[PDB]
Amino acid sequence: EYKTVVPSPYIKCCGTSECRSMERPDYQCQVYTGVYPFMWGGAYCFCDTENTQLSEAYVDRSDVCKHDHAAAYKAHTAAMKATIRISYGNLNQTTTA
Amino acid sequence: SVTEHFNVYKATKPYLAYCADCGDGQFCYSPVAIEKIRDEASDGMIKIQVAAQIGINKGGTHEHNKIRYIAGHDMKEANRDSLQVYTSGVCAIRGTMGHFIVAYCPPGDELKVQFQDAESHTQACKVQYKHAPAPVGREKFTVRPHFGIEVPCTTYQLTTAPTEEEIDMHTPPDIPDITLLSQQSGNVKITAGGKTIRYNCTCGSGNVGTTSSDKTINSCKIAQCHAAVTNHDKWQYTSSFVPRADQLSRKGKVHVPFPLTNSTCRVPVARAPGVTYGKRELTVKLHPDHPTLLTYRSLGADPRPYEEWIDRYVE
Amino acid sequence: PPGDELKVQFQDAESHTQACKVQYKHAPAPVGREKFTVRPHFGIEVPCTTYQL
Amino acid sequence: SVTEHFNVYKATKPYLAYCADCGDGQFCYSPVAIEKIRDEASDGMIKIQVAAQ
Amino acid sequence: QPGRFGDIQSRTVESKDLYANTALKLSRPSSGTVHVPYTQTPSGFKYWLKERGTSLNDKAPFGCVIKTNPVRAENCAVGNIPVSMDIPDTAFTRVID
Amino acid sequence: QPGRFGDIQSRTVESKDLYANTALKLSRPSSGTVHVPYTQTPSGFKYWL
């Protein structure tokens, strides 16, 4: 399983930023202009449409790939080993070869 | 013990996030906004992350009966016996630590977490979740039997020890509030409720907000003016529903308890089927208490495997 | 939620519970083209009819 | 009445038994260990035997 | 491919490079809300887990019993095992006795 | 036969002799538990009902 890491977005109040590509698997970055977010106490930013929010998300190995994972293999040259009992005359022994 | 395991949270603070469905059919701003449910346990346990912190009081100390959260600006209190988890019926909670709750839940279509508020109100957050745990072994049982066999599985350990898995922590952002303003002739007052309040006024001086109460000369009144609380001494979790304060590296660091550990679960054993021997025929009576898997294959060169889940009596 | 009955109860002044149960097909039709049960945190708005509070 | 009908139990005592699933997913030793449930009723009534009195 | 087994791939458990193809998408936030909307393909690992079906143990020919640690097939009833024998004199008995 | 109509049979309501074929089985108790494990075929009467 993967893990989609979505950090808190940077909201540029009455300003503008640029997306910076990073070396992250399945990386996405988006700058949205004209945002007017709200909080519980009221409006977060100051202007009406002069604002940008930076959306960033990526895929990372889950915390339990170390525990929960499936392995893809190639199988060839199967080696056979068998357990045999030899009991003749007075002896009665078991060996593996 | 529990104290040197909970001391990691005191440096943190609960947060208020946007929950799209708070029990009823509408959004509101609740302290139990569910962030992410983790389901890595083979026995059906699920982990729920909530906005409120469970087991920590107003000061920061550890109790087994208090839940701290955000109601406006000030931290407040809640009791633990009222935390409940709902999917289709009532879920069995096995352990709570801060933002994280683990519980045993029946199969369901939703995941609701609610507690009783200090205002005697009920505050909940509802999300959509496919909770359809896979069977452990070959019998689709729901209740652990009193006899059977043990089958290995994965489970969350009920310990508070720190683990490699953790969650990001950072400084809280600016928190605006319209009520921190009152319109007065000339000197518009910004009631200084809190530690530090920032303002910026088009007609007035604006600039930095500093602290304490100030009497800003301006005719803009409430309009062209608003204030936000800043410099929170504690820390927030970088939730997806809260704006980022800044493009800097994270500040605090909090682990995720209840690590996945190897374990085994008792499973029921089906009754031996009744076999009548026909001439190179095999007929069996199947009496399952629950959906039971019947499997056979030929021992020769060309096998003919079978599959069928048995829920009633069949032949 | 979707159900087969409709029970309404209150706690009586005698600390008793007084209820009334009736049979009702409560199977609401989907709003739009997805059979969802929980309002999401993002999406699109579809017109509908509601009771004003 | 009820008193000369309950006088039969005074000479008895409740017991603690092994319940394999006490709400949560694990066993413990509870005073409501269910022994047998009987459904001889055509109207849907069931009888539950518990450890406590 | 996203949504199937192998949507994310890692060469080793101690691998630093991770390949991820989950068709992650970003979209405008709604007005007056800070939520970082994103739509992404669900994990193909869980899809495989609940669509795997039965393993090789349930379909192996010749009554093979498949175990892991290490991956092996035991007690398969097929073929012959040639035997070469080197018996000393001590084992045998004389016809005089 | 167990699990079908007539799994247990009695000639009369006042009969003292009772025939029962329910394939009752007994098995080891688990370690540290007193529960008398047993597995038995369900009643054929309720199945017929």
Ligand SMILES: *[C@@H]1O[C@H](CO)[C@@H](O[C@@H]2O[C@H](CO)[C@@H](O[C@@H]3O[C@H](CO[C@H]4O[C@H](CO)[C@@H](O)[C@H](O)[C@@H]4O)[C@@H](O)[C@H](O)[C@@H]3O)[C@H](O)[C@H]2NC(C)=O)[C@H](O)[C@H]1NC(C)=O
């Ligand atoms: C549940 O219990 C499982 C069994 O104890 C745990 O899985 C074990 O986890 C350890 C540590 O991560 C793994 O150790 C690795 O071993 C590899 C080599 O692979 C194995 O194969 C060789 C033969 O080539 C064989 O001799 C050994 O079994 C090897 O360990 C090393 O190269 C690594 O450095 C590392 O030591 C075990 O492989 C793994 N066991 C198995 C059978 O997968 C599991 O972590 C536990 N999960 C929990 C705690 O929930």
Ligand SMILES: *[C@@H]1O[C@H](CO)[C@@H](O[C@@H]2O[C@H](CO)[C@@H](O[C@@H]3O[C@H](CO)[C@@H](O)[C@H](O)[C@@H]3O)[C@H](O)[C@H]2NC(C)=O)[C@H](O)[C@H]1NC(C)=O
């Ligand atoms: C403190 O608030 C002042 C206003 O009191 C904010 O000033 C605002 O600054 C933004 C800068 O982006 C101006 O928006 C636009 O500027 C762009 C420049 O590319 C231009 O294309 C648009 O036409 C628009 O003007 C905005 O006009 C300006 N408002 C003013 C000067 O009244 C300032 O950003 C705030 N500073 C803090 C504390 O954040």
Ligand SMILES: *[C@@H]1O[C@H](CO)[C@@H](O[C@@H]2O[C@H](CO)[C@@H](O)[C@H](O)[C@H]2NC(C)=O)[C@H](O)[C@H]1NC(C)=O
């Ligand atoms: C040789 O000795 C071994 C080990 O004592 C015998 O193995 C046991 O044989 C008897 C039954 O014949 C029992 O004690 C066990 O069922 C056997 N144990 C096994 C199969 O591991 C073995 O049969 C002897 N072989 C000979 C004399 O041919």
